[PDB]
Amino acid sequence: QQWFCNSSDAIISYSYCDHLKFPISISSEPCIRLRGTNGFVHVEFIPRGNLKYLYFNLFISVNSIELPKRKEVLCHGHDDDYSFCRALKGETVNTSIPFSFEGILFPKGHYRCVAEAIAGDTEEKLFCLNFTIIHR
């Protein structure tokens, strides 16, 4: 319900989590095509942690078959590559990150991903998102 885009071959949607509702606005340009894409992802929110040791826990599910759990490090403290690694709790963050991906084949079906952002220094959850992708 929060946000959804229809690409050429994908339908992407997200909604808030259930045990955490901390606002965050996020979108992309253009709507991703699981057949390889290259574009930008826009973010806007107000942290509730220091964003200095920020990483993600991803719980993914393909056609109801849980993969293992993924952990993606985004900032690590020492001369990070992104400008927002230096925001503080209460400080408006508003940015656009570039990305590209290509070369993998994805099984058709229905995917789900629960992506929760953790402040690594204190182990608190900054937010939790409930994603839903349908590849056709």
């Binding site: 590559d81 992104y82 400080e91």
Partner: protein, 595 residues
């Protein structure tokens, strides 16, 4: 207390409840209060009077819009005060008055306008100051800084600074003793008035994300002549506008600045020629963190680099180096799988190649690193080392570390045979079926072994610890041992910690350990013991800790002597409380037979 206590009478986390004033029922003697996102709108006199023990206060995103005169009256030990987010546009005089030990003021995003109308003149203890994201327009340092004697960092990042002029940093000319650390990242600097820096000395200067024009950056950098900096940090950010063409000619101007340690962070377009620019020869400590370099082919031989660090930088091939002055090379967390190449570094004394997929096929030869003075080698978390020599020339090493690598061919001969003065070996989690009792020969000075995920032949601890007298810390955990051969440990007269958890021992013996005069900890839990054969009075009395948890001791009158000793000499055992038995009946602690 309308808020959640973390610790009894301390650390009262009160974040994000609908409040409009600091609670009155919060006990004094508290030390850390957090009122964030509460909808306060004005601070009032004496409101914090009783908290004459508080030393960490946070008021972020509260909608503070004004402040009463004697707001922070009774605060006497407050060290850290945060104020991010509050739209306090004008700080009228007399604010920050009561505070008398503040050490770290954070005023980010408080719609500030200038650093002169900032009544902090008397805060004579302030270490740090952070006013990023604050509408400021001029780098001009105000005069009252002369009073803030112990100030060692100022952060002006993400402001509206546009130009630098000679009368700014005037304070720094007249005061050649202030040990200040500046920062101006993300300021659209376009005109550094000539002669701006002259006779100025900073301890650090960040300039990441300033310019987006090649010539603008060229000339601005050029105007820094005269500076004398201890750490100059350059680079860009991924999520911002940035240069599309970077050429070593931009480095011009830096050719007359006394840099002392030059760090170069991420850069969108990077040509390996940048680092080979004729006016880096005097830099003392190069560094690269995130730059997508490919080949570090060949640097001149008059460069005076005394250090070199490459962290998280992509690489496709081990660099080739001949610097006769470099020492302490470091290449870590590389983003590729490279194989080691022979180098010639006559002055190297510290090497670190961890966290890469460094497959190092030949091994331990002076021919691979022309240094007779190495002291710290580290190849942890690498791909696959292949031993083919016993450190014929590296006879000074004092610190070796092969963790998580696949260490191949080490059981086929006395490796480590020449490391006669080594202090810290570590071979944990290298799949190493110890099946040769000469594997640790020559390590006459070792003090710390660490093997955890390593097997043995027959699951029997062989006699591999002779001629290792000085061992003081020994970790055998997580091996899948099933019995301890007789005679081991019989000469470790100084071992003080002997970890053996998570093994599959069937029982315990006391004839062992009988010569461990100095032992003091004998963690032997999680290894499914039943009893302690042998006379139970030969243990060393110096044992202070003995884990016996997650065991399976059978208290079915099995060794009544042991079942009595276990509940008698328990002022040493760990968690004697929940010592369950495993033979019906369970849930017990004492056996009926005494003495």
């Amino acid at each position: 207390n309308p808020c959640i206590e973390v610790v009894p009478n301390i650390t009262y986390q009160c974040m994000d409840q609908k409040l409009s004033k600091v609670p009155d029922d919060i006990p004094s003697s508290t030390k850390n209060i957090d009122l964030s996102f509460n909808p306060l709108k004005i601070l009032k006199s004496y409101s914090f009077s009783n908290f004459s023990e508080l030393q960490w206060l946070d008021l972020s995103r509260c909608e503070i819009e004004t402040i009463e005169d004697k707001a922070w009256h009774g605060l006497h030990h407050l060290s850290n005060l945060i104020l991010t987010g509050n739209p306090i546009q004008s700080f009228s005089p007399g604010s920050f008055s009561g505070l008398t030990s503040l050490e770290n003021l954070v005023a980010v995003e408080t719609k500030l306008a200038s650093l002169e109308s900032f009544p902090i003149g008397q805060l004579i203890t302030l270490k740090k100051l952070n006013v990023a994201h604050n509408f400021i327009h001029s780098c001009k340092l105000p005069a009252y800084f002369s009073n803030l004697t112990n100030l060692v960092h100022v952060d002006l990042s993400y402001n509206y600074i546009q130009t630098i002029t000679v009368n700014d940093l005037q304070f720094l000319r007249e005061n050649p003793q202030v040990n200040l650390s500046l920062d101006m990242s993300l300021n659209p600097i376009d005109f550094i008035q000539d002669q701006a820096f002259q006779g100025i000395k900073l301890h650090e200067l960040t300039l990441r994300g300033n310019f987006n024009s090649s010539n603008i950056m060229k000339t601005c950098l050029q105007n820094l002549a005269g500076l004398h900096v201890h750490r100059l940090i350059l680079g860009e950010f991924k999520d911002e506008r940035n240069l599309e063409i970077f050429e070593p000619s931009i480095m011009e101007g830096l050719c007359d600045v006394t840099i002392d340690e030059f760090r170069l962070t991420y850069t969108n377009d990077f040509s390996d020629d940048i680092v080979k620019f004729h006016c880096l020869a005097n830099v003392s400590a190069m560094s690269l963190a995130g730059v997508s370099i490919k080949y570090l082919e060949d640097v001149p031989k008059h460069f005076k680099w005394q250090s070199l660090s490459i962290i998280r930088c992509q690489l496709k091939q081990f660099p080739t180096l001949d610097l006769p002055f470099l020492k302490s090379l470091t290449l870590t967390m590389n983003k590729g799988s490279i194989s080691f190449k022979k180098v010639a570094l006559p002055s190297l004394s510290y090497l670190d190649l961890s966290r890469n997929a460094l497959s190092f096929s030949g091994c331990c030869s002076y021919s691979d690193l022309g240094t007779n003075s190495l002291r710290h080698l580290d190849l942890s978390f690498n791909g696959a080392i292949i031993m083919s020599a016993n450190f014929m020339g590296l006879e000074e090493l004092q610190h070796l570390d092969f963790q998580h690598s696949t260490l191949k061919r080490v059981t086929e001969f006395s490796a480590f045979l020449s490391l006669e003065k080594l202090l810290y070996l570590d071979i944990s989690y290298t799949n190493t079926k110890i099946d040769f009792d000469g594997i640790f020969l020559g390590l006459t000075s070792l003090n710390t072994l660490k093997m955890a995920g390593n097997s043995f032949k027959d699951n029997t601890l062989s006699n591999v610890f002779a001629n290792t007298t000085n061992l003081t810390f020994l970790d055998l955990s997580k091996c899948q041992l099933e019995q301890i051969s007789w005679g081991v440990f019989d000469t470790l007269h100084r071992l003080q910690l002997l970890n053996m958890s998570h093994n599959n021992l069937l029982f315990l013996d006391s004839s062992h350990y009988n010569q461990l005069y100095s032992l003091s900890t004998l963690d032997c839990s999680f290894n499914r013991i039943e009893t302690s054969k042998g006379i139970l009075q030969h243990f060393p009395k110096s044992l202070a800790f003995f884990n016996l948890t997650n065991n399976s001791v059978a208290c079915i009158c099995e060794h009544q002597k042991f079942l009595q000793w276990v509940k008698e000499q328990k002022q040493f055992l760990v968690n004697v409380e929940q010592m369950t038995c495993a033979t019906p009946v369970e849930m017990n602690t004492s056996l009926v037979l005494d003495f």
